[model samples]
Target: HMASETFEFQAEITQLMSLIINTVYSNKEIFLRELISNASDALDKIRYKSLSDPKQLETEPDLFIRITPKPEQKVLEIRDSGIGMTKAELINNLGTIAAAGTKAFMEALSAGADVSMIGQFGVGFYSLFLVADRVQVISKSNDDEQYIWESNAGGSFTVTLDEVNERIGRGTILRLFLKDDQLEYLEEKRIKEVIKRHSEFVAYPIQLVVTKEVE
Candidate 1:
């Protein structure tokens, strides 16, 4: 069994999730751009943090995003070398719906608060559940040890201290087990189009590994 955490969604937020998944974002392809925007945000956070500590640069030297397609296994992976989240952050960020406090935090920052602070949108990561049947996150934070988080979009998810190879260096890898209905996302051309449309202005490089010939 997966070591799991359960979190309650605010009344309005639960309703919002249903609406977004079922109605608002009618296009399934928007998920790619959403993920890329998230990756860019993560990279921006790390770069800002590096300005003060400098050591962060040595630790997470290169900041980029890479998307790899594994069609044989029906998996699409988005890898980023940026500010990874701690276990607590993973729970708070992933489990919750609306981050009421994040708005206040941003307001404080606009009033001369530290820019190194990360943005706190509460429900961005949940977009994965919109497409993936199963999702896995392998992350390593500068403030804590590496961890892996997995979920199937139910009310609960799992977190565990990783014991395997740390292939991502210092960041996060979001692996989406693409559903049979979403196989087009696995194609390189389609993935590139999504990235270009949504994330071209992102702070880091977004590359998609291509193995299939375009028709």
Candidate 2:
């Protein structure tokens, strides 16, 4: 059995979230783009490791990203078959928001300085809140059991081991609780438009699926 507990996020993370959702203004449809890019990177990492340890490929033996949109449910789920994160990495990457890079970027902005170094930081994860009131992440890694990391871009987040009786395959699933006004993201046309512009460049295969009627 695994420990059933919730790990909360530091205040810094919530504030960083405020900065993104409130500080900037736009349609911010790039949330999907940035996320796909990150997922693409995750897949690339596993494939690269296979060159040295062929067993890495045998773990999942699959490389794909699937996006399932449910407009009626006001949710969007993006899943990938790639190198998933362990309990530790999830806490550090998604929970801890006081990294040297994030801190510096926040400082630069608050101090009345112009900084365009967003690409250099791990802010993409937080972008989920752009349209989501809550986010759920389920990941399975070779080093540990499958786990779930959930948050609402608020003062706290939680991480705990998940019970999985079957093979989870190696990867991560990000389920977003889409905001009422942001239901457009759940539309097939909007999703495909974004992918054509941003995701087409990714080297890996990204398959899209619509669980509802496509308009």
Candidate 3:
């Protein structure tokens, strides 16, 4: 039996996609904010889960998110040591559209009742496709074995058991294979600005490596 199912976007979905691709998300910098917001949500979930089940805290107890840029490889990696998704959860969480829930979540968030409440809804992952040509996810969940999910943002995605002889304990890493025009995102200065603007009070330390030029 197949462990997952695939579906196509409806005609109206395609139209909405075009609107977002064409006009709504005109600023590419917004992607960073979207990602940071998603990370904040993840951290909040783990915190809530730990309150009732301490075992869930085995993963990075002090949850945080980090973004690393690999300009040479044309990739940007975003990592979070929070609640990772399972194989089945990955599909349902990342594969389908949550239009109604997403709209309601955004509305609730905008009204100031703490948007983190909707992180469990899993709609933020979709924003990655807006900037990434290809996306890869490496996740280790407390509930299940580690897995990898890869997609080119086409109609389908693939998930397979990770054979790499390493473990992350519990967390998730998302690598975005960026388009040629999106290389500026790899610059440390730009990433810092993005993080400070959108995630300054994220409740965890967000660190990055910096280099100083010798005179």
Candidate 3 Cα errors over 4 Å, as ranges: 1-25, 97-122, 209-215
Best by lDDT: 2
In model 3, state the lDDT of residue 99: 56
- What does candidate 3's lDDT look like per residue over 1-215, in tens digits? 22533444433333323333343345566666667777677778888889999989976676778787877788888888778888876765665555555665555645753433443545556566556777888787788888877776555667877776257677788888987777887889888887788675678667665444698
* Pairs clashing within candidate 1: none
Q: Write out the backbone clash pairs for model 3.
A: none
The 10 consecutive residues of candidate 2 with the worst lDDT sum are 113-122
Model 2 C-alpha RMSD to native: 3.0
Candidate 1 local lDDT, 1-215, one digit each (tens): 24545555444444434433343334667667667778887888888898898898677688889999989999999988989988887766765635454444445545754422322434455466556777888888888888878766544567877776355668899989987788988987788777777574676888778785689
> Per-residue lDDT for 46 in model 3?
81
Q: Better model by TM-score, 2 or 3?
A: 2
* 172-199 per-residue lDDT for model 2 (tens digits): 9998999887898888888899889866
Model 1 superposed RMSD (Cα): 7.1
